[PDB]
Design a protein around this nucleic acid. Structure first.
Lengths: 91, 98
DNA sequence: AAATTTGTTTGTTTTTTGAGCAAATTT
DNA sequence: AAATTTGCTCAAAAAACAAACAAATTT
């Protein structure tokens, strides 16, 4: 059904899958909960950055550091990959 | 004084630990363990679109949640997300959420 | 009655892109 | 020895943009 899921455990010690989107939801819920009233400036180019670093780190781990297949997997350009690596400093 | 808070820890997701103790680990790891498992129960398939798949998993809620928090007001959400109002409407239309 | 926010468009800039290429590196 | 992947440059096509509004809606 859903390809992107994380394990969870309920009180009765049952491990159990759940969509990733359900964490992100929680993630944020909590963020907002936190700041009472403090304007939020850059929420998009934040969460992105907290989701690209792992995607990158991991779809390189999986390709043995082959930037070319790396890109083919991610469906984006050999170039823009080198950029995104520079951005988080990985290349 | 203000204790430091790393970015790792600015977006967190509660988890149970080795001493069934409730700790608070970065979203990062969710995205991390999510892809680990996506590879595991994969094998050999042509995977040409991995970026977009992740993205459309992360954009949906970000929008889902930001809109609920501005009780419908785009102009804010857009300003709050640090993105052009046009491109907000674009993204919305993509997932519904109109 | 204001004032804001919506729904459009019109043009510019910033980003992504393919397609080349020598040099380096893996097979 | 051969195939490939890097690191770069170019130009082209595409996505994001800010600035303008009238019409709609909310303060």
């Amino acid at each position: 059904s859903d390809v992107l899921t994380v394990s969870t455990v309920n009180s009765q010690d049952q491990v159990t899958q759940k969509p990733l989107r359900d964490s992100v939801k929680q993630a944020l819920k909590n963020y907002f909960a936190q700041l009472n009233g403090q304007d939020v400036n850059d929420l998009y180019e934040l969460v992105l950055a907290e989701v690209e670093q792992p995607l990158l780190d991991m779809v390189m781990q999986y390709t043995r550091g082959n930037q070319t297949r790396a890109a083919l997997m991610m469906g984006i350009n050999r170039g823009t990959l080198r950029k995104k690596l520079k951005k988080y400093g990985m290349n």
